Amino acid sequence: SMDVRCINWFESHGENRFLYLKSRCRNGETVFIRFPHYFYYVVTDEIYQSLSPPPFNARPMGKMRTIDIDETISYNLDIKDRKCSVADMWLIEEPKKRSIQNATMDEFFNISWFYISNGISPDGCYSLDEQYLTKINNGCYHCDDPRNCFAKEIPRFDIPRSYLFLAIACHFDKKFPSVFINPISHTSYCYIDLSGKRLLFTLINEEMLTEQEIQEAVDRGCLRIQSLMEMDYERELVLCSEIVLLRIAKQLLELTFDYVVTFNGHNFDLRYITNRLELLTGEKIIFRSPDKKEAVHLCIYERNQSSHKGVCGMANTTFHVNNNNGTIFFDLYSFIQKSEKLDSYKLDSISKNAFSCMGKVLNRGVREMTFIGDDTTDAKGKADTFAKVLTTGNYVTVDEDIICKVIRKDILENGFKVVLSCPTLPNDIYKLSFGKDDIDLAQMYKDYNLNIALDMARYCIHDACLCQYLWEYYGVETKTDAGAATYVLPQSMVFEYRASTIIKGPLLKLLLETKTILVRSETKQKFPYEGGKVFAPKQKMFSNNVLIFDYNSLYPNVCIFGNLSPETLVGVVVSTNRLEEEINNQLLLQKYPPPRYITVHCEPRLPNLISEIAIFDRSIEGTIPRLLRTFLAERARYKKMLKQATSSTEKAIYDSMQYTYKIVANSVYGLMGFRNSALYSYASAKSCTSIGRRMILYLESVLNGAELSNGMLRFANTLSNPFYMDDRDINPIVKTSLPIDYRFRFRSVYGDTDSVFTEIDSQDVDKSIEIAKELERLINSRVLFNNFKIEFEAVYKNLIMQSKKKYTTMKYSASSNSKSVPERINKGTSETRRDVSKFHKNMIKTYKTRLSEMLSEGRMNSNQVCIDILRSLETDLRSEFDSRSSPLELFMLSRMHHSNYKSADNPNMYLVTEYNKNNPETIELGERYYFAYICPANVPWTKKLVNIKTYETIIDRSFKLGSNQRIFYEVYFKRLTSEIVNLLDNKVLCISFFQRMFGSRPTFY
Amino acid sequence: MNSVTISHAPYTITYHDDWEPVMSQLVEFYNEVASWLLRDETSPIPDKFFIQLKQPLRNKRVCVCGIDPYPKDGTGVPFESPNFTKKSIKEIASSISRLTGVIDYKGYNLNIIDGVIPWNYYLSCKLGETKSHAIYWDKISKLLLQHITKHVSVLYCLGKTDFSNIRAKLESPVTTIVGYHPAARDHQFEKDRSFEIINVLLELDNKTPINWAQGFIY
Amino acid sequence: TSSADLTNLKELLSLYKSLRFSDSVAIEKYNSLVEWGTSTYWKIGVQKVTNVETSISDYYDEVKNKPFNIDPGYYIFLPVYFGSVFIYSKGKNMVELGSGNSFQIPDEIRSACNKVLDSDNGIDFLRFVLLNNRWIMEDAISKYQSPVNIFKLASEYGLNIPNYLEIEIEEDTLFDDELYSIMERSFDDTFPKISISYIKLGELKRQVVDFFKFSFMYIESIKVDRIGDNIFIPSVITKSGKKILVKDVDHLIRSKVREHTFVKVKKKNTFSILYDYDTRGEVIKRIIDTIGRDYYVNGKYFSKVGIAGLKQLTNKLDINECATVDELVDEINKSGTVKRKIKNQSVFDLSRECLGYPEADFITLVNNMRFKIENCKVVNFNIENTNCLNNPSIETIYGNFNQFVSIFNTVTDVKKRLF
DNA sequence: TGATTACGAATTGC
DNA sequence: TGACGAATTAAGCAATTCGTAATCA
Ligand SMILES: Cc1cn([C@H]2C[C@H](O)[C@@H](COP(=O)(O)OP(=O)(O)OP(=O)(O)O)O2)c(=O)[nH]c1=O
Ligand SMILES: [Mg+2]
16 A cells, blocks of 8 residues: 555445545555545435434535526616525435435536545545454455545655557458458457557467468467467467367456457457357356455446437447456547547557658669658658558558558667669659558468468457557547546546536536525526627738737636626616616616626617627626636646647647546536536626627727838727726727838738737738737737737638638748748648548649649730630530549548438438448448448439439448449539639639539529 | 148148149158158157148238247147147237236137238257257248238247348348247246237338237137 | 336326417427437327417317207307407417417416415416407316316406306206397396306316307498597498497408409307308508508507607606606605516616517518617618618508607616616 | 528637 | 446537529419
C-alpha cells in the first residue's frame, strides 16, 4: 500500500455490490482496494425524522438553499419573488434501492457522490494509511472509511504499464468469413510487460499447409510446437494447429494487462476467437474479480444510442466487453469514429490520414525510385513518425494515387531512406503515405503455399503494430488522465457519454460549494428562437487584403457578463399593445436600475405579443457562469501548453484537447437551450443570442468606413456601450503608434456570428499585419469592455465569396511575413463536403484555376470567357463519356446509416436493409458506407432524368463493375455543370447549353 | 402446406403458405449450423423445432414472445406444459384468472386463443443450460420474428433485460410492450396489467379485443 | 405497463371517440397523449389531428319536405327556433358550430352547466340555441337516461327549457301541413319556430322535419332595434310592413343585400326567414352608411359610440350610483367580490370593457398609433399609419378616444388608492 | 406536357 | 426450483444543395 497512483475504477455485479480501485506503487506492485457501494439520496431534516425504517447511515450536509427555477410570464411590473427555502439537509446511504417521496438532487450518479462526498479524485496519487485497511487476499485490501484512508494527497510519480495489441487474419472463400466454415489463419501480438520489454510474435495455423512445407518452414527458421506449454514469446514466427493457437489466445486474454487494444476487435476479432474456441473445444475465456469471488465469461454486448431530434430513433451502436478484473479493453474504431470526421473509417483511410510525409527524390532509373525524408523536408517530427511506421510497413502510396512495394529501408537519426518499385517520376518532391495494399486476398487463399503464409504473417504483424502507432499518435493516455481529472469519472468511462453527463461532476461540486439546490414544479414549454447574425457579402472577388477579427469564447463570455442563469432571472415582462409597452418601459427603467440589473429585449414568444423584456440580477454569481469559468480555465491551460510544443504529435494532441474544452463550453449554452435538460432556461438562451447580435453589430458599426491618417485612428461611430451608460470615454479619436505617413481606409464586407471581415486598400502583407496588430490593441483597450476581447486571426488574399457560408482564399497567419508560404483555405465549398465526388472536385479545381488565370490575363471581348469555358467543358465531358477511362473510385459518394426517419418507406433505409439481407457483411447503425449511380450499359445518353434514387448501389470492397453495367455519368455531369454555370456571368448562353445537354432549366443565385 | 428438404435433421420442414417468402433463406441458414448444433442433446427434440411454422399468420393479431424454451421437457409449442407443472404457465394462468374471474380450472394453453401466436426467439436450448444456443439461431431468429411482426398488430415481449434492444433488431416499427418475465423473483409480474393494455391498444387500432378466457382447459 | 398507463390509454380512447364535439383544450390534450403513447410504445393506431371540422350530422339526417306516414311507438317532440347553434361537451368549452370558438358566456350559465354536468356522467353532448341573448337547451341526448328528467332538473337549476311533448299513436296517420299547424299550436309559444324533431324511446337517432315555401319580397331599409344595453339588432321592414327576422348580422353582410331591392325568402304561416348563399368591405361600408354614421359593428351585434360616463363604470361593478370619486371606493371594500374583481383584472382590460369595444379592432387600432404619457397616464395620442383609415368602424372607434382615455385615467388613479 | 412551390434529409459553418 | 441488473439518455440555430411529391396552367 502506502504510496499509490490510480489506474482504474470499476464495479462488480455479483451477489454483493462493491467498488474497486486498481493502483500501482513506486516499485511496481499492483494493489487493489475494495469499497462497499451505496445508493445515495438527499433529504430534508423533516423527512429524515419521518423515515419509517431508519436509514443505514446518514451524514449531515448543513444548511442548504432550495430555489424553484421555473419560468413564468408576467403582464405588469408587480413580479412575485422566486420561491427560496433554507433547510438542514441529510445525505443518506442505502445498500439497496429505496423510493423516497420528496428526495432532491436526483440527477447525479452514485460514483459522483462517492468521489465528491469522500474527497477523492479518480486520477490522483495518495498515501494510504493501513489503519483503515484490512487484507482480504494477496494484493487485495478492504476499506470501510474512504474519507480517512484517502486523506493525504501526494505529488504525481511515474509508473510502468503493460499493453497487449492484437490482430487476426481468417480464411475466406468468396466474401466475408463465417465462424462455422472458415478457420483462423494468422494471429499477431505485440506485448509490453511491466519491465519495458517489447515482444512481437505471430502464430501461423499449420493445418492448411502440406507436411513438406512444414518441414521447409522449420528448416527456414520457424519453430514448431505441439503443446501450449512449449511456446516461447521470444520467437518471431511460430507455426502450430488451430486448437493450440486458440489456447494461447485464451491464456493471453486472461492476464491482468492495463490495456488490451484492438481495431474493430469487439465486433470481429474477439467475437470470432470466442466463437471458434467454443465450437472446436468447449472452453471459455473466464474473468475473475480481484477478491476471487466472482467469475464471468467473455460475452460482447451492444449499446444502442438514439437521437434527440424528431422521431428520435436509433443512431449509433457500439460493442463492449464484460470483464470484471480491471483491464481496459479499448477499440480504436469507435474512438476515432467519435473523434474526427473523414470519408471512410477503415484502417487504410486512417493510416493514410495519419502517417504521411514529404520526400525528396535521390535516385531514379530502372523500375525503382529512392526517396529520403529528413527534418529539412516536411516539418519537425513528421519524418520520425514515418520512420517509426516504416519499421513494419510493406506498401507506400506516392502522390495520392500510385501504390508501390518497399524494396529497401534504412532508418537514420533524423529521418528515413526508402527504395520503392514505381515508374519514373519527373519531379523533386513527392508525398508518401501509408495506405492501401494491392493484393487479392481471396486469390491468395485459393492457392496457398509457404511464401503466401509468410507474406500474410508480415501483413498481420503490421496490422497489430498499427494499433500501437495510432494509440501513440492520438494521445489516448493524456486525454484519459485529463478527462478523469476534469469530469470526475472513472478512466474506463471518459469516452462513453456526451455533454449531458460529463458536466455533472463539476456541477455537483459547484452546488455543494455554493449550498444550492434547483427544483422544477411545472412542465417545460419549447418555443423557437433566433440565432447568430450573418451579413450578406458585398462582392464576389476582392483583389485586396482582408483582415479577419474574431471574438474569444463569445457565448460563454456573454453568459458571464449578463449573469445568465435560470436562478438569476427576475422575470419576463410582456405586453400586447403599445400603451402598456410604454407604461412598462417607464416603470422598468427605474424599478431595476442598470448597474445591478440587466434588461434584455427579445422577439416575442407568441403571435399576439408585441414585446418581451427579460430582467437578470448581478448581485450574486450564478451557477452556469461558474461552470463556464471552470472550462475556460482548462482551455487556457491547454492553449498555453500548446504554445510551448515543438514536435508535431504534441502539437496535435494539445490542439485537440483545447478544442474539446471549447466544444464543452459551447455545449453548456446549448443544453441551457435544450428542452429535456435539467438546466433548461428559454429566457437565458434567447438573451445570450440577443447580446451576441448586439455585440457583432456594435463592432461592425465601429469598423465600417473607419480611417487612419497621420498617427491617428477615427472610427465611424461613438464608442458607446450598447446596453447602458458607463464611465468609459466615448471619443472616436484615438492616438496610434504607427508611422505618420500611413493613410488607409477600412470597410466591412462579411461576418458570421462573432467575426468581422475588414477590407483594407492595400496589397502588401507586412504593412497589413502591422496595422492589424495595432488595430487589435486599440480595439481591446478602448472599444470593448469588461470580459469582451477580440483577436486578429489572419490576412486573406484573393478572397472569392460564392454565398453566405462558402469562400476560398489564401491565408497568412498573424506570425507571418511576405516571404512565407500561404495556406489554401476552402470553407463550405464543393471540396470539403463528403458527398460531392472525386471527379467533381478535380474538375472544379482545374476550371477555377483556368478562370482565375484568364481573368488575370483578361480578354472578355464580347463573351469570350463563357464560350471558351463551355466549349472546354463540353469537350471534356464528351471525352470522359466516350473513353470511360476514369475508374469507379472517382465516382463514389459516402453516407451514414441510421433509423431516424419520418415515414418508414425511406429509400435510403430500404437500400441498406436490402444490402444487409443479401450480403454476409452487415452495415451497422452508425457506419459510413460508399455508394454510386449505376445503369445498364446499352442505354444511350439520357436527357430527362426521372428517377435517380432507383440507381443507387452500395459499393463494397469486393465490388466489380459488370460487363452490362456503366456509371450513370449524367447525374455527376449535371451537378458539375450547375456548379460551373453559377461562376460565370452570361445567362442566355448558359441556359441554352444546359437545355441542350440535359433538357432542363438551370438554377442561379 | 408445403414441404422442403434440408441436408441434416429433421430432413423435412412442412410449413403454411403464409411462411413461403422466408423458407428458402431459412434453409440456407440452417445448413451451416446444423452439424454443430446437433452434437448435443437439446430440448425440444430436433423433430419439433419448426412445428409453429404450420400456423397461419394472416389471421393473428398478437404475439407473446419468450426468449428460450424450457430447459427440460419442451413440447415445441412455446409456453406449454401438457401436465401444468411449469411455473411460468401456472402464474400466467393465475393472473388471467384474476383478470377474468374464473377460479376452477386445470390447464391453460396460449395456443388455442384466436388471434394470438406464441413464439420463442431461440428455437433450442441444451438440457439444463438456458440461452446456450444464441449463436446458432441468431439469424434465423431475426428473420422469423421480422416476418411475424409484419402481420400482427401488437408485439408483447416478456423479459426486461433480454429484449432491451428489440427496436434495433426490427427494421419496421410495430406496437411493442416489454414486461417482466413471469418466473421473475421479487413478485413483479403480479402487479403487471399488460393484457388490459393489449386490449385497449387493439381496440384503439380498430381491431377486435382478445377473448383471454378462451385458453382455459377443462 | 403500470396502472397509470392503463388510465392514460383509456382516456385517450375516450377522447378519440368524441373528437368532432371537442374544443381546443381537449384537442391539445389528445395530441399530447398521442405523442406520449407513440413515444412509449413505438407505434400507435391513432395520429395527430389538428383541423377537426366540427359537425353534428352523425345524429341527424336529411330534412323532410313532404308529407309522410307515421304510426308505431310513442313520439317525443322537441322544437327548434332560429338562432346560433352551439355545442357543449362533458367538462369542455362552449363552442360554435362550424367555427368553434371560446364564445364568452355568462358566469351563471357556466355554473349551471357545471352543476348539470356534475349531476350525472350520462351525457354525450348538449345542443344550444341562441337568439338575442336568450339561451336555450335545444337538445340533450344520452345513451342511458331519458329526455324527460334532464330538462326538469335543468329547469329547476334556474334556466328554462321548451315544453318537450309526448304523444301516442296507434293507427296509420299522415304527417302533413295540417299536422304541422297542429304541432305549431301545440308548443304554444310566441318564439319563432322552425323545425320539429321527433324521437322514439330506445332509438338514439333523431329525425327532424321542417316545412317551408319560397317567396319574393322587396327590401326597404335597415333600422336598429333596442334589445338590451349598448347592443342593437338590425331589422328590415317590407313594403307591406311584414316582419322578416334574421339570426345574425352575418346573415345580412353575407347576403350582400342592396338598398331597395327584391330578394327570395322562405315564408311560413307565422313568420319568414331570409335565405343566405346568394366585396366584404364594400358590403360593410354600404350597410354602415345606410344605418347611419353613428354606429359600429360589435362582432355579431350592433352597438353605439355614446359618451358613456361614470355610471357606465358603476353599473357593472354592482355598486350604487354616485358622482364623487372618493365614494367609488367605499362600496369596493363593502363587497369582497367587487374588490377581488377589481384587483385581479387589469387596468386596460377593465377600462376597455367599460365602453364595450370589441377585442380585435381596438387592438389593431392601438398597435399603429403613437402615445405620449406621464406618470402612468395618457396625455397625447397621434396616428402614425394611415392604412387603418380604410375600415369605417375604425373611424367609429377613433371618434371617441377621449372618453376612453378619461375612464382609463380615472381607473388608474382609483387603483392607485384602493390597491 | 410542362412551371412553380413545399418539404425532408444531409452536410457544413458559427 | 423458476430472471434482475450491470449497459441511469439526450447541446443550440443559420445557410445551401438535391430529389421527390404536391399544386397549378
Ligand atoms: C463552433 C460552435 C460555435 N458555437 C457558437 C458559440 C460561439 O460563441 C459562437 C461563435 O463560435 P466560434 O467563434 O467559432 O467559437 P469561439 O467564439 O469560442 O472561438 P474562440 O475559440 O476563438 O474563442 O458560435 C456553438 O454554439 N457551438 C459550436 O460548436
Ligand atoms: Mg470567437
